Amino acid sequence: HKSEVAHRFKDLGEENFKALVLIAFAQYLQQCPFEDHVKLVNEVTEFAKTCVADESAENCDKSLHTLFGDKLCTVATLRETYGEMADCCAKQEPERNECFLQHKDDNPNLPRLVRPEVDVMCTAFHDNEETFLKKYLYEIARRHPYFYAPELLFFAKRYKAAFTECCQAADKAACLLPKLDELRDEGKASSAKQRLKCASLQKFGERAFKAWAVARLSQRFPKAEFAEVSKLVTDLTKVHTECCHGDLLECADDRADLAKYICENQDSISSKLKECCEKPLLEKSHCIAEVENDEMPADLPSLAADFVESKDVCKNYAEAKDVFLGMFLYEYARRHPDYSVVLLLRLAKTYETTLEKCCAAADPHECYAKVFDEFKPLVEEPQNLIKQNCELFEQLGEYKFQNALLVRYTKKVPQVSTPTLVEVSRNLGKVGSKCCKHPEAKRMPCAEDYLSVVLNQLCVLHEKTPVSDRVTKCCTESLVNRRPCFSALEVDETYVPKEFNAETFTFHADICTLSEKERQIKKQTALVELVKHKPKATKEQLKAVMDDFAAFVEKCCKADDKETCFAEEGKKLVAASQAALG
Ligand SMILES: CCCCCCCCCCCCCC(=O)O
Ligand SMILES: CCCCCCCCCCCCCC(=O)O
Ligand SMILES: CCCCCCCCCCCCCC(=O)O
Ligand SMILES: CCCCCCCCCCCCCC(=O)O
Ligand SMILES: CCCCCCCCCCCCCC(=O)O
Ligand SMILES: CCCCCCCCCCCCCC(=O)O
Ligand SMILES: CCCCCCCCCCCCCC(=O)O
Ligand SMILES: CCCCCCCCCCCCCC(=O)O
């Protein structure tokens, strides 16, 4: 186009345009105050409108990169506030845009964003809706400078809807606060999956990524022919490679190009895309990324004919090994939207190892005729774990399910900090509540997605304060083996019990007036410390103490002098437990 800035304004609309411009400037200029950014936005928006009136007007034919970088270099405090970043302005394009990209700070050392009180939030929302939401858009964007800007805007719009509904409710906090909690976790999770995709691309390479994509696209689009899936894998690997590099415009163009291709070829891909493909450009690729799986074709034959029984298996494999393995994966995956992606990848690795071994024998057909037998236990291991865990969950409920997990994992890796053990155990209990309520055919993909978030959060905490070689092994393995590795951890036989600390087991009356969440965390913290100190305690012995503890808190919180109960009765509880455990 003649004026790229005009074309974006016409397509996005003024409101969306202004929000994305704010996000982009805040992700580059993460230390500038909100008011400086509003000013930049308004100046960009009035310039764009001149181009919309006349694509021939001055500087309207410049590229978006040129115009955006020129504008960053007009910021008066650029050297004073960002130092080295200001040297990027001495560069010509495209060197200049690359230089700005390298100086984004993914950990900018800003204070934590505090969630104010419900009445305070709703009153600001009422008083000035636009400034309220845009100031938070700025606060979030500047702390997460690689988060894809359109998706940030998608969250903002759901926040607007939560405040609009809940600030009119009779019980405002009961309406609003679980919505805020859901949006925060979903947002944190989306950021985790973006960073994990990019890190895994770098370490394990393009082929491993393409394998994942084949499985993932074949479950989503089971009616597509392999050649169409395989072209989609190629395009999607380009999109993720460019987006991981971090330039917003290039990432957005690649995503938009792929969505347009999909929507122009729906008959070859899926019957579920009509609604997404009617949406504006801004929303299209995100919508497609979240489409439900297509219904699979009926009466698909077994894989045995093409992959086990054919006389030609080794010949077809040897002439194009990755293509044949891709076809096996495509056929296996389109048939099993109830499997995790990593499960499908385990099966393809197993099939590959067998063909490597068996196509070297004089009778390969005899050698690999049983290969589908090897898949059965790989498939069953995660199915059985889900059954067991969801059963335990319905029998205990989330809290006591969390506690069962807390004791198990403390004993396996008692060197982990107590905060992390509590947090990871709680989040794992949340996975059970979320995914156990799905029918069986959707439980494994649910578990894979949310476990990938929780286990990454663990590996991230641990990578920075490492304490256990066995965790570091599970966190550095292939992502295909990550969960089985964690599932294979055993009780630490060589741990030296932690030395008793009286204060760790001293409880005060503030526990009666704490939040339910903080009371839970308080008790789960002490349960972890209890297992760290007496790791060889039986479940019977632990339950006895947990029951003594429960009577101890309920009694003292109803007693006239509470402070004295907790200290005197408390001393009794400790002395008795110390005798009943070891
Ligand atoms: C990227 C979304 C921006 C839209 C505005 C966010 C909503 C305002 C409240 C945010 C307060 C912190 C949230 C939380 O801690 O749960
Ligand atoms: C957290 C990843 C990007 C944000 C996605 C929007 C929804 C979450 C809003 C609340 C997150 C707080 C951000 C922070 O405190 O750093
Ligand atoms: C169609 C192009 C992709 C070909 C993929 C071949 C898949 C078979 C081997 C899978 C190996 C597992 C991936 C990984 O190591 O993480
Ligand atoms: C940065 C200057 C403002 C205009 C361009 C903002 C970036 C384009 C985002 C909208 C396109 C989304 C495409 C997609 O994700 O499928
Ligand atoms: C880069 C994400 C947006 C690209 C456009 C959607 C193409 C089909 C995606 C199918 C699901 C893949 C999930 C993913 O990797 O985001
Ligand atoms: C602090 C981290 C300690 C180790 C965490 C282990 C994570 C296990 C992931 C799979 C859990 C499936 C349910 C189960 O069998 O417990
Ligand atoms: C905390 C337990 C959550 C529900 C039960 C999860 C059991 C393990 C799931 C295994 C499937 C995830 C992906 C994989 O390893 O194949
Ligand atoms: C040797 C130290 C003994 C300390 C005795 C008190 C132990 C407190 C464990 C608390 C477990 C709370 C579980 C619950 O009922 O929610």
UniProtKB/Swiss-Prot annotation:
SUPFAM superfamilies xref list: Serum albumin-like
GO molecular function, one term: DNA binding
PROSITE patterns: ALBUMIN_1, ALBUMIN_2
Family matches, as InterPro entries: ALB/AFP/VDB (IPR000264), Serum_albumin-like (IPR020858), Serum_albumin/AFP/Afamin (IPR021177), Serum_albumin_CS (IPR020857), Serum_albumin_N (IPR014760)
Binding site for (4Z,15Z)-bilirubin IXalpha: K238
Effect on the protein of changing E356K: In Coari I/Porto Alegre
Variant or mutagenesis effect after changing C175F: In Hawkes bay
Record's keyword terms, sorted: Calcium, Cleavage on pair of basic residues, Copper, Disease variant, Disulfide bond, Glycation, Glycoprotein, Lipid-binding, Metal-binding, Methylation, Phosphoprotein, Repeat, Secreted, Signal, Zinc
Post-translational modification: Glycated in diabetic patients. Phosphorylated by FAM20C in the extracellular medium.
Modified residues (N6-succinyllysine): K203, K434, K517, K562
GO cellular component: blood microparticle; cytoplasm; endoplasmic reticulum; endoplasmic reticulum lumen; extracellular exosome; extracellular region; extracellular space; Golgi apparatus
Gene Ontology terms: biological process: cellular response to calcium ion starvation; cellular response to starvation; negative regulation of mitochondrial depolarization
Residues modified as Phosphoserine: S3, S56, S63, S271, S417, S487
UniProt-listed Gene3D superfamilies: 1.10.246.10
Modified residues (Phosphothreonine): T81, T418, T420
Carbohydrate attachment residues: 10, 49, 135, 160, 197, 223, 231, 274, 279, 311, 315-316, 321, 349, 376, 411, 437, 442, 492, 523, 532, 534, 543, 571
Effect of D363V: In Iowa city-1
Effect in UniProt of substituting K534E: In Castel di Sangro
Subunit structure: Interacts with FCGRT; this interaction regulates ALB homeostasis. Interacts with TASOR. In plasma, occurs in a covalently-linked complex with chromophore-bound alpha-1-microglobulin with molar ratio 1:2 and 1:1; this interaction does not prevent fatty acid binding to ALB.
Family: Belongs to the ALB/AFP/VDB family.
Name recorded for this polypeptide: Albumin
Originating organism: Homo sapiens
